[PDB]
Design a protein around this ligand. Sequence first.
Ligand code: 3OT
Length: 124
Amino acid sequence: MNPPPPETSNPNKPKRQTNQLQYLLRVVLKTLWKHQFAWPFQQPVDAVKLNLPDYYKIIKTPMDMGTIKKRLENNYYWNAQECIQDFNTMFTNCYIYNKPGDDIVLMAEALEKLFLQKINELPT
Ligand SMILES: COc1cc(-c2ccc3c(c2)nc(CCc2ccccc2)n3CCN2CCOCC2)cccc1=O
């Protein structure tokens, strides 16, 4: 019942290393990945194992940090904005599916505050 995970390899498009992409992997992803609340966000939502009714009927653009980490490690992103959009999608999905006060929402909000603190120091 789960869909295949988001693509993470980039076989047909060009690749580049930029200072912003370096910061996104070394600082932003690394800081959130090591956070105590990271585990639920480290791989695609398994709606079957988690018993999440209608998850993939409600969430049509799933995203997670395991995918973002692999995308950065595989040079899937050409522009830093593509990666920032993926983090935003991951948080937004959680807020859409869940309710205020749910444990997962409080965890996502703490991770998003940390994301915003780090994104404030994104370079040029
Ligand atoms: C990201 O969005 C959501 C996430 C989750 C979610 C909550 C807890 C989660 C998780 C996802 N993924 C994991 C870790 C991976 C996992 C998944 C399946 C069973 C076991 C581990 N865990 C920890 C499980 N815990 C610890 C080990 O004892 C079992 C209980 C729930 C709801 C809505 C969402 O929108």
